[model samples]
Target: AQNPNCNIMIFHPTKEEFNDFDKYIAYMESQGAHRAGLAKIIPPKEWKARETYDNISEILIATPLQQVASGRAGVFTQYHKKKKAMTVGEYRHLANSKKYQTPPHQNFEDLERKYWKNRIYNSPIYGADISGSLFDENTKQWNLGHLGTIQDLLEKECGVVIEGVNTPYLYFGMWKTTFAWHTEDMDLYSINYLHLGEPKTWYVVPPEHGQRLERLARELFPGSSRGCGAFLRHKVALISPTVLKENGIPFNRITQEAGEFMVTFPYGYHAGFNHGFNCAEAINFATPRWIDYGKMASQCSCGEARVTFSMDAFVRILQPERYDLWKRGQ
Candidate 1:
């Protein structure tokens, strides 16, 4: 039994209604969150029927950050890792074109046949065009569903708006579009819902052995050191479940289908990619124990605790239960 807490938890809500949102939120917050993984979400009825960004508008294509890092084998390049630009009208070419090569021109033609969607990003913070089908289009009016994501339940206790307070991070991915490996900063829990579209594949390592994984990672990666975020990075070291198996570390895998929500706990390591063209919405929430996480990550990781890791806020927002649990000054 993978005890103490699970490396991964999968829940299929009997119902995906706004009314049932509370229990789902409570179950996830109970643990492993700071990296939990899949709940095949069933969005409120209206959004459930939408399968693609068929007639959607305004959103532009995603250009992955150039050369994030050369992983263990491949150099993670822009077009190499993923896209098709243009509006939805022109986008139909993905379904129609026969001789067309994917933008990067890899021989992964089977990759396209399997998944045709490209990755797009809409960030309320980075100033992306927001009103497209690739983003909010229909769901924008669905406020009840949005409000139920529940990041605020933590924000109220933590004194900082981690999620629900800001523009949520919108993920639009095509075949091969990916979020490379990295843990959200200490003191944070990232929750993601496949808002609509195809399923995604996720890889996660539990928090308990994060530092141990970091040590093992440097041996497999380029330029990782104790002084840097190390195993905590945007650059994946290409460690697959099989690879971890060879190394003897237990990990979890899930193919999160459309409408499911997943959580990644603090210090939990995770990375995921679009199976085809998929759209997901993600935000961060913090648990009371996040305060102690903020303190340790600051000193241990060498620098840049996630933007939410405010030492001042940690001092002010300790959880009521943690008062007796984690000793003072930890």
Candidate 2:
């Protein structure tokens, strides 16, 4: 079943609105899109959306079934050990074949016969860096790297490529392969564009209820809660929308189809799976407003992972006059 409020707000941005990322994002936030945590943006049909199939590289195979069968409280971390290696073309062929070489675990046949009748392969590739190769160099529109403040503030301020954060990364997902619940690195906003293939389903918890989701996750995984304060950043936990709803957590479910963009707000928790073979390009971006959230994220750090990129340095570069301007209170 879906959430009671399954309506993840969708925006059809005109060419002008879509190109002007700052103005459009502010408008969406003003209309309470941020409160929803995630919104779907459908680009105009006329935009030159390119395919990066020729540019992709060998990918790590993600096995979701192993984690599920292990009966762990949650699927934390990714499965990258002893996995198959294949190109995107081969992956789609394997996914389409709907067959697995070996069963996930001992009771594989029984599990397949009884509960999960679908084929055993639940492979999805996570975080394939395609920043430089994603689009044609000359194309200005729909380029994830150069969008709005991402170019104006983030890349311009940093003057370096922050892979998977500032630069784009691609994901090739198969049926039911999940990306666990987590916010963007540094509590920054994330935008994911589905290049092509089946719809990707997302479950997002609003920014206000982010703590509630954390508490529930802590309740579910007490060990991690005690060990790591920022356990969610690990991207290893998965809680269903149905379960979230039952726990009184407000969420929005979104089906992100091809040529669509899903934007996750700062400090918002989102997780979901693909319907079938699909490819998506995503990157993190920061606005002037994200500085406050970045500070909070740094303070809350429990030594899980080092900062992705230095927000303080970026802020100093971004607003050199801030301190002098603040002195005007005198």
User: How close is each model in CA RMSD to the real structure?
Assistant: 8.1, 8.0
lDDT of 1 by residue, 77-162 (tens): 12133333454334323422442222444433333333222222211111112232234435443232254322454466545664
Model 2 TM-score?
0.74
Off by over 4 Å in 1: 1-7, 14-23, 29-55, 62-155, 158-165, 226-231, 234-236, 298-330
Q: What's the lDDT for all of these models? A: 0.48, 0.63
**lDDT of candidate 2 vs native?**
0.63
Number of the top-ranking candidate, with TM-score as the measure? 2
**lDDT winner:** 2
lDDT of 2 by residue, 117-194 (tens): 332234444334334435566667667767655435655544644323346777776655567788876688998888
Please provide the root mean square deviation of candidate 2 (C-alpha atoms, Å): 8.0
Candidate 2: list runs displaced more than 4 Å.
Answer: 1-7, 51-69, 72-84, 100-133, 148-165, 298-330
